[PDB]
Amino acid sequence: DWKSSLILMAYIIIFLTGLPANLLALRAFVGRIRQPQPAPVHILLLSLTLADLLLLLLLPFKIIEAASNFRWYLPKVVCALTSFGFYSSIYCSTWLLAGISIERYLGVAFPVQYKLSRRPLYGVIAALVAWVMSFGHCTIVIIVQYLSGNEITCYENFTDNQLDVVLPVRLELCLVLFFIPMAVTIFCYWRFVWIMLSVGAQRRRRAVGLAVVTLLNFLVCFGPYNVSHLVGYHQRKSPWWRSIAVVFSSLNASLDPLLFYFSSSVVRRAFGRGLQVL
Ligand SMILES: C[C@]1(C(=O)N(CCCC(=O)O)Cc2cccc(Cl)c2)CCN1C(=O)c1csc2ccccc12
């Protein structure tokens, strides 16, 4: 009861804290465009904002669930659409954050290439690759898993045979769409921070802060969910703390705003104006 209510209120907080800041971020980038940005970084970040918006706008469904002890029964189609809605955002975000890690390292360190390739169009493909990879692979999940008065919004008994097909797919996504980005993100930022270490204080604090946020996201926000998938092999059963792990997956949407503040000064100016009003 209260155990459920807490997640409801936490999700409301995430919604009511996130959505305004994310809309302000979206507007900030739309502002930062001025003449459509020449910078590949600013495009990739915009995609993350859209991926966040996609999640945050669909987030309220969860607060409604948490009230009703996951009772209200949704059609299998609706259940699938909402599930796909979530999956897309997370695994898109991971590759985008990896793309940012690439961008900062390759951009700042070894700047000769960045001086020549300061055109925006070379960047756009990375966002499209992230979207295509996310959508394309995530679709497989809902294909496989989809085509009574129990306390479950979507009870996932599946089938004993299907289990043997389903879990490998979840592990495949877990590995390729997270554990690989993880290996890239840390490899880039470890160097980027070293290069930055080797206005200056502001640049340093921005650069470190950026890396801290990206690291934190993978461990705190995305970690437990992707661990919970892997535990699937050990237990051969959906862990009870999946619903808890999901909280963290949503939490990212609250901390992603900071990324934009640390990255782009225009966002700091825009939030400055927003804070001036508020
Ligand atoms: C919550 C969950 C899901 O879809 N379930 C959970 C099974 C039941 C269990 O065991 O609690 C069914 C479900 C949950 C909710 C709505 C529908 Cl219509 C169907 C699992 C990750 N995920 C989403 O992809 C997700 C979908 S909307 C959304 C919003 C925010 C975060 C994540 C999500």
Coordinates of C-alpha atoms and ligand atoms in Angstrom, one line a residue, residues 11 55-56 58-63 65 70 72 74-88 90 145-146 151-156 170 225 229 238-240 242-244 246-247 249-250, ligand 1:
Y11 CA 7.3 9.1 -10.2
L55 CA 9.6 8.6 -21.8
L56 CA 8.4 11.5 -19.5
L58 CA 4.4 8.3 -21.1
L59 CA 5.6 8.2 -17.5
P60 CA 2.2 9.1 -15.9
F61 CA 0.8 5.7 -16.9
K62 CA 3.0 4.2 -14.2
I63 CA 1.7 6.6 -11.4
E65 CA -0.7 1.8 -12.1
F70 CA -1.4 -2.8 -11.1
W72 CA -6.5 -2.1 -14.5
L74 CA -4.8 -3.2 -20.7
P75 CA -5.1 -4.9 -24.1
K76 CA -2.1 -6.8 -25.3
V77 CA -1.6 -4.2 -28.0
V78 CA -1.6 -1.3 -25.5
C79 CA 0.7 -3.3 -23.2
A80 CA 3.1 -3.8 -26.2
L81 CA 3.0 -0.2 -27.4
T82 CA 3.8 1.2 -23.9
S83 CA 6.6 -1.4 -23.4
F84 CA 8.1 -0.5 -26.8
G85 CA 7.8 3.2 -25.9
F86 CA 10.0 2.7 -22.8
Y87 CA 12.6 0.3 -24.3
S88 CA 13.3 2.7 -27.2
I90 CA 16.6 3.8 -22.7
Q145 CA 7.0 -11.8 -26.3
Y146 CA 3.8 -10.6 -28.0
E151 CA -2.9 -8.3 -9.3
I152 CA -0.8 -7.6 -12.4
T153 CA -1.1 -4.9 -15.1
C154 CA 0.6 -7.3 -17.6
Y155 CA 1.3 -10.7 -16.1
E156 CA 4.3 -12.2 -17.9
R170 CA 16.9 -9.8 -23.1
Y225 CA 17.6 -3.0 -14.7
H229 CA 17.9 -9.1 -16.9
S238 CA 11.5 -12.5 -13.3
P239 CA 13.0 -10.9 -10.2
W240 CA 10.6 -9.2 -7.7
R242 CA 12.2 -5.4 -11.5
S243 CA 9.5 -2.9 -10.6
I244 CA 12.1 -1.2 -8.2
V246 CA 12.5 0.4 -13.3
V247 CA 12.3 3.4 -10.9
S249 CA 15.5 3.7 -15.3
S250 CA 13.1 6.6 -15.1
Ligands
LIG1 C1 7.1 -1.5 -16.4 C2 7.5 -2.4 -17.6 C3 6.3 -3.0 -18.3 O1 6.0 -2.7 -19.5 N1 5.4 -3.8 -17.6 C4 5.7 -4.6 -16.4 C5 5.0 -6.0 -16.2 C6 4.3 -6.1 -14.9 C7 5.2 -6.2 -13.7 O2 5.9 -7.3 -13.5 O3 5.3 -5.2 -12.9 C8 4.0 -3.9 -18.2 C9 3.4 -2.5 -18.3 C10 3.7 -1.5 -17.4 C11 3.1 -0.3 -17.5 C12 2.2 0.0 -18.5 C13 1.9 -1.0 -19.4 CL1 0.7 -0.7 -20.7 C14 2.5 -2.3 -19.3 C15 8.7 -3.3 -17.4 C16 9.6 -2.3 -18.0 N2 8.3 -1.7 -18.6 C17 8.1 -0.9 -19.6 O4 8.6 -1.1 -20.7 C18 7.2 0.3 -19.5 C19 6.0 0.3 -20.2 S1 5.1 1.8 -19.9 C20 6.4 2.4 -18.9 C21 6.4 3.6 -18.2 C22 7.5 3.9 -17.4 C23 8.6 3.0 -17.3 C24 8.5 1.8 -17.9 C25 7.4 1.5 -18.7

